[PDB]
C-alpha cells in the first residue's frame, strides 16, 4: 500500500530547533494514536524516543517533543545537541495488528567545530613477534569531519603497500574513528630505521614515526 | 537497553536456513509474549516481520518463524534467499516508557569462505605513556561476514566504560577489518593485572589478553 512519507532531512544548528513532520493516512495516522519515533544512528539499533505520538520513555532526552496534526505528525527536536546526528523513523498502527514505518528523516546538526585528528602509531608487541609476525597500527581518532587520508612511510619512499586503512566510524560523540594497518614481517621490521603514519585531515597533516626502540 | 543479545553475524547460503537468537537479560522474559522481529535493509526502514513471538503480519512469508523458550526468543529464515540479506533486530515491550531492542544480527549470504577474526591486541606505547597517556587498541583483522562484537575487560570485570568500536570495512582481499579501543590513563592501566580484548564472530569467540608489565 504505502510507507509513511518522511523527508530525508532536518538540518538544524547547535541550540536551534528542528521539527520533523511525518505524513500518514486515514487508515493509520488518522484513525489511531499509535505513532512511534525512532532515533537510529548509522547501523546501530533503534530506540523509542516518542511512543504515543507525544510521550517518551522514562529514559529519553528532556526536550524531544512530538505531536499529531490530523494526517501529519511531528517530532519537536528542540535542544540541538549533536549527539543525535542520525536517521529518524515514524510508525503507525493501521490494519489488524499491522504497523508501518516511515521513509526516514536524516537529521543533521550544523556548525560543529573542526576537530583535528589524534594520531597514535603502534609497534608490534612481543606476543605478536613471538609468533613471528609484526603488524603496525595507526589509530586516527577524535575528529570532525570524517574525510582523512592516512599515508604510511617506509622511511621517505612510502610503504603504501601491505596497507589496510579502514575508514571512519563516528564514535561516542559524533567525532570520528579511523584505523590503518601495515603487515610487517619482523625481518623488514628490523630493516630500515623508522616507519611513519601521516594522517592528513582538512589540510592539517600529522606524521607519527615509530622506530624499533621501545620496551617490550 | 541492549538487555537482549543477538548473534552479531548470522549467515548461510541460498538454501541454508538460518536461526537468529535474541537471548534475554530480562528477569521478565516468559512473563511475555511480546518479542517482535524487525528485519531491515540497507537504507530502508525496519520492517516488523514477526509480532508477539509467533505471528507474522501480512506479506511476511510463512517461512520466517518465531519461537521462544526460557530467555531466547528465536527466528528462523527457513530457506535463505538472496535479499534476505539484512540486519534483524528484536523488540520486547518490557512495560511502558521502556521498549527495548536486541543489538541487531545480520543475515549474510556467503559468497566467499568464512573468515574468523585475527584479533591483534596492542598495548600502550612507551612514548605514548611518555606523555602521561595510555591507550590500548584491538585491531580485529580478516573476517567474513562483516559483523563482530568486541568487549573489553580488566581483572574479571568488563570495562564497558572507555571503548570505541569502528565498523568493519572491505579490504582489498574482500575480507573485513575492524578496530576498537580503550583509551585511558597510566593510573588505570598500571593499577591492573590483565586487559582482555574479547571478540565474537558467530561461533568463534577469541579473547586476547595484555598485561601491565610496563617499563617507564
Amino acid at each position: 500500500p504505502s510507507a509513511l512519507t518522511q523527508p530525508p532531512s532536518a538540518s538544524g544548528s547547535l541550540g536551534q530547533s528542528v521539527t520533523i513532520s511525518c505524513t500518514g493516512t486515514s487508515s493509520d495516522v488518522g484513525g489511531y494514536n499509535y505513532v512511534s519515533w525512532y532515533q537510529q544512528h548509522a547501523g546501530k539499533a533503534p530506540k523509542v524516543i516518542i511512543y504515543e505520538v507525544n510521550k517518551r520513555p522514562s529514559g529519553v532526552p528532556d526536550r524531544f517533543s512530538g505531536s499529531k496534526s490530523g494526517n501529519t505528525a511531528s517530532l519537536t527536536v528542540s535542544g540541538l545537541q549533536a549527539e543525535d546526528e542520525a536517521d529518524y523513523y515514524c510508525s503507525s498502527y493501521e490494519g489488524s495488528d499491522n504497523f508501518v514505518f516511515g521513509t526516514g528523516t536524516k537529521v543533521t546538526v550544523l556548525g560543529q567545530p573542526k576537530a583535528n585528528p589524534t594520531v597514535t602509531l603502534f609497534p608490534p608487541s612481543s606476543e605478536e613477534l613471538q609468533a613471528n609476525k609484526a603488524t603496525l597500527v595507526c589509530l586516527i581518532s577524535d575528529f570532525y569531519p570524517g574525510a582523512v587520508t592516512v599515508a604510511w612511510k617506509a622511511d621517505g619512499s612510502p610503504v603504501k603497500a601491505g596497507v589496510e586503512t579502514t575508514k571512519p566510524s563516528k564514535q561516542s560523540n559524533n567525532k570520528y574513528a579511523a584505523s590503518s594497518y601495515l603487515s610487517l614481517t619482523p625481518e623488514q621490521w628490523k630493516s630500515h630505521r623508522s616507519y611513519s603514519c601521516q594522517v592528513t585531515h582538512e589540510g592539517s597533516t600529522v606524521e607519527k614515526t615509530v622506530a624499533p626502540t621501545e620496551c617490550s | 537497553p541492549s538487555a537482549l543479545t543477538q548473534p552479531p553475524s548470522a549467515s548461510g547460503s541460498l538454501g541454508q536456513s538460518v536461526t537468529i537468537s535474541c537471548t534475554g537479560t530480562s528477569s521478565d522474559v516468559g512473563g511475555y509474549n511480546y518479542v517482535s522481529w524487525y528485519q531491515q535493509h540497507a537504507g530502508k526502514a525496519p520492517k516488523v516481520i514477526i509480532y508477539e513471538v509467533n505471528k507474522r503480519p501480512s506479506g511476511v512469508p510463512d517461512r520466517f518463524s518465531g519461537s521462544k523458550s526460557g530467555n531466547t526468543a528465536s527466528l528462523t529464515v527457513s530457506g535463505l534467499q538472496a535479499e534476505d540479506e539484512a540486519d534483524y533486530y528484536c523488540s520486547s515491550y518490557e512495560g511502558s516508557d521502556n521498549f527495548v531492542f536486541g543489538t541487531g544480527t545480520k543475515v549474510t549470504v556467503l559468497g566467499q569462505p568464512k573468515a574468523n577474526p585475527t584479533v591483534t591486541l596492542f598495548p600502550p606505547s612507551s612514548e605514548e605513556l611518555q606523555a602521561n597517556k595510555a591507550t590500548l587498541v584491538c585491531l580485529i583483522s580478516d573476517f567474513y561476514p562483516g559483523a563482530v562484537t568486541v568487549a573489553w575487560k580488566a581483572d574479571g570485570s568488563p570495562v564497558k566504560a572507555g571503548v570505541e568500536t569502528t565498523k568493519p570495512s572491505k579490504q582489498s582481499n574482500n575480507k573485513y577489518a575492524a578496530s576498537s579501543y580503550l583509551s585511558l590513563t597510566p593510573e588505570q592501566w598500571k593499577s591492573h593485572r590483565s586487559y582482555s580484548c574479547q571478540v565474537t564472530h558467530e561461533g568463534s569467540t577469541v579473547e586476547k589478553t595484555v598485561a601491565p608489565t610496563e617499563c617507564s
Binding site: 499509535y34 511512543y51 510508525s91 498502527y93 495488528d97 504497523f99 | 511480546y34 521498549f99
Partner: peptide, 4 residues
C-alpha cells in the same frame, strides 16, 4: 511497537 507494542500497541494494544
Amino acid at each position: 511497537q507494542x500497541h494494544x
